Design a protein around this ligand. Structure first.
Ligand code: MG
Ligand code: MG
Ligand code: MG
Ligand code: MG
Ligand code: MG
Ligand code: MG
Ligand code: MG
Ligand code: MG
Ligand code: MG
Ligand code: MG
Ligand code: MG
Ligand code: MG
Ligand code: MG
Ligand code: MG
Ligand code: MG
Ligand code: MG
Ligand code: MG
Ligand code: MG
Ligand code: MG
Ligand code: MG
Ligand code: MG
Ligand code: ZN
Lengths: 108, 66, 123, 143
RNA sequence: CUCUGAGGAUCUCAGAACUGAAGCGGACAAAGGUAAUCCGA
RNA sequence: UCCUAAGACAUAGGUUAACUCCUUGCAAUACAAGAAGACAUUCGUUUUCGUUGUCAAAAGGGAAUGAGGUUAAUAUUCCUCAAGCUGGACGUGGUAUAGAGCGGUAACGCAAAGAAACCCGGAGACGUCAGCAGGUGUCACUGGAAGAGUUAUCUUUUCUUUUUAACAUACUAUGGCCAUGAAAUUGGAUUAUCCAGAGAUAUCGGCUGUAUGUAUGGCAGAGCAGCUCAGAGCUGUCAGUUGCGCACCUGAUGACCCUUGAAAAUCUGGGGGAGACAUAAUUUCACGCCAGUUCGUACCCAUAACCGCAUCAGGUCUCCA
């Protein structure tokens, strides 16, 4: 049974301090420091809270390292909104202007 | 370390201080290019691709065998 | 260690005098249940996929196993054979009608039990 | 009750083209062996003409006017059927070629339309009931 | 200790028989009860 | 070291004989306090936007590294080998445009595909408990090979080794979406809940998200185990199975509150299209060139390196089993 040693001078077990046991070519079982998981990207509209598709879930840093693709999608709000919200936006805007004009002609 | 399946890209890389490292294993052979940020390996099974690639070693690149 | 596991597998060393923990402690009920449920549902799925059962039968049987009506997988099987054999229409019956249905079902059963015998002889 | 007609302006809802305006060239109730669902063939403004000042210059005012059209097939369900209609702006039956579309000629139709639209837009006649609509066709929608 | 049956996939449970200085949670581990009275819930 | 917290202190203003004292992030009991750009490139000129500070975390947030080897004493630091990150600056190829990629009905896709003010986002960014599922490590078992223990008797025996780092490419992964079609003899589904005409189930359907997964590269050349030779040499490191087992991590849930569980720096996306530009202009593609400063890294962390007048039966916060 192999036992491990923290490698960092932080002996306290903290979400940021997690460790994983790796088996080396040497035959050693070594602590390797595991990173933290992050929350998936959600659509930004009010009360929506939908998981966006086609965007990478990545720790904030690695976001500078990835390809344009993972940072984005091809819609009108590709990154910020989901389709449903896009759609409802379109529709709402169009119909609202229609009612606007109608009120305009009814005023003139 | 990257590995290459298609000889073409490999040959574009060794055509691009250049030395080539070839090493023998029982069932396979490997050809190895050193480049700034990557070590390129190329494996083949059959002797044909083998000899053909040994042929492919240019005057610019020197061949080391382990 | 191995020799003991041997005898334990032959069943020589398990007894009441050898048991320190609760029945529930050794193996928790919940596991036994999950295992049974999972078995029953895997079965109902094989059957509903093979057309042997229909969505109504599936549902009724699913809620059947949810209700601990079937101890065995063998028993769920027997009761599926029953839903198939008995017409699933058991509603609005006069006792004359149910007597008749009973005897029709008994006849069927006997019949097929007979065939299931004869086919093993010739093979 | 049905309005699918050649010349009706519709908005695309979801798609890379979502949010854009376009006109119905053709409508296939149930579609081809190729597209087995209800769809419409459409020609629309991909990039709209940018705003033009009364203070700009010649080259400015001309460049500003550039339009980039697109021709797309869209499931009717992805469409918002605008009540605005422009039938006469061009002959789309003529310029939209089933051939050219399937034939790897896409860019050709592109050019043709670019030409047509750009021409029409500066040529917009202010008294045309056709024009009140035309403007809206080249209009930019706000989400 | 010697057998028997039941629960599952592409380890639990129950029966019977035989055998010992009637012993067998054999170490380890591991509540003594009951009925009243007074306080404080 | 940077960031913010509970907090704290200047500055400004006021109080005191005076010392001292009172306010300040939701920043002021204050307030003619700032930042940026460009040309200039000093000033100056000029333009734009603007109310005003700092310190407090060696368990919180937090750009990127690993395996092997080495010393008498250091090593994720040195050596060897293999990687990544940020900031520079051009070189060579390549994307895009006479305005600014292409494909799919759609989810979405693809080395790359123009831009300022301005306004909004995402991640960072989070409680406790309960059970379910998966992965890693460990433990167990199976055939093969090398070594070792036992051998009066028995034992095709008993033990041992049988390893794979970060990182690269491709695939799979508990969820969510998109079509097509709509469900009553209602169905679907979990251990548990729970979902559906506000579109369930279902299709040789499709898209997408997470590996402590698989394959190959790394890589065997290393490590490990044996056997020789007199520092060199040779051989093998192979192929399977299962677990309500255990520790950790992840995934999808559930329960709970007169409790409801930080913030900032940092990385990134969207809406907008004022400007810039023909020998031109601008662009999250490849491959190449340059740099990474300062301080801490020994050793004890306790029935003898700490505090208990001590080499004291006391006391003193964690991880691996
Ligand atoms: Mg390097
Ligand atoms: Mg238990
Ligand atoms: Mg018994
Ligand atoms: Mg007896
Ligand atoms: Mg006793
Ligand atoms: Mg007593
Ligand atoms: Mg009390
Ligand atoms: Mg504060
Ligand atoms: Mg204060
Ligand atoms: Mg770091
Ligand atoms: Mg180094
Ligand atoms: Mg760089
Ligand atoms: Mg929570
Ligand atoms: Mg073995
Ligand atoms: Mg799926
Ligand atoms: Mg070797
Ligand atoms: Mg488990
Ligand atoms: Mg613990
Ligand atoms: Mg909450
Ligand atoms: Mg934009
Ligand atoms: Mg002491
Ligand atoms: Zn949304």
């Amino acid at each position: 049974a192999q036992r491990i040693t923290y490698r960092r001078r932080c002996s306290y077990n903290t979400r940021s301090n997690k460790v994983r046991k790796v088996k080396t070519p040497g035959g050693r079982l070594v602590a390797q420091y595991v990173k933290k998981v992050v929350n998936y990207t959600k659509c930004s509209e009010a009360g929506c809270n939908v998981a966006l598709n086609g965007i990478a879930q990545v720790r904030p840093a690695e976001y500078a390292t990835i390809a344009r693709s993972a940072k984005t999608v091809s819609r009108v709000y590709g990154g910020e909104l989901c389709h449903t919200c896009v759609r409802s936006r379109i529709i709402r805007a169009f119909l609202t202007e229609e009612v606007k004009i109608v009120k305009r002609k009814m005023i003139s | 370390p990257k590995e290459i399946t298609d000889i073409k890209k490999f040959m574009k890389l060794w055509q691009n201080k250049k030395v080539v490292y070839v090493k023998t294993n029982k069932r396979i052979t490997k050809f190895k290019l050193r480049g700034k940020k990557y070590l390129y390996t190329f494996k083949t099974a059959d002797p044909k691709i083998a000899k053909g690639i040994k042929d492919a070693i240019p005057a610019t690149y020197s061949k080391i065998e382990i | 260690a191995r020799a003991f596991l041997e005898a334990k597998r032959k069943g020589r060393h398990t007894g009441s005098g050898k048991r320190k923990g609760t029945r529930n402690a050794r193996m928790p009920t919940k596991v036994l249940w999950m295992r049974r449920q999972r078995v029953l549902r895997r079965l109902l799925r094989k059957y509903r996929a093979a057309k042997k059962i229909d969505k109504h039968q599936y549902h009724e049987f699913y809620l059947g196993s949810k209700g601990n009506l079937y101890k065995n997988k063998t028993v769920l099987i027997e009761a599926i054979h029953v839903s198939k054999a008995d017409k699933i229409k058991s509603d609005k019956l006069t006792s004359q009608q149910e007597a008749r249905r009973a005897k029709n079902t008994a006849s069927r059963a006997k019949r097929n039990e007979k065939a299931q015998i004869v086919a093993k002889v010739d093979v | 009750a049905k309005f699918l007609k050649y010349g009706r302006v519709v908005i695309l809802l979801q798609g890379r083209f979502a949010g854009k305006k376009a006109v119905i060239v053709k409508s296939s109730e149930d579609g081809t062996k190729d597209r087995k669902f209800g769809h419409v063939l459409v020609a629309g403004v991909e990039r709209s003409p940018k705003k033009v000042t009364k203070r700009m210059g010649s080259k400015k005012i001309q460049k500003r006017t550039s339009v980039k059209p697109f021709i797309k097939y869209v499931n009717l369900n992805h469409i918002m059927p605008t009540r605005y209609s422009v039938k006469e702006l061009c002959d789309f039956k003529e310029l939209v070629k089933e051939d050219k579309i399937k034939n790897n000629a896409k860019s050709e139709v592109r050019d043709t339309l670019k030409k047509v639209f750009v021409e029409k837009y500066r040529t917009i006649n202010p008294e045309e009931k056709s024009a009140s609509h035309t403007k809206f066709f080249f209009s930019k929608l706000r989400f």
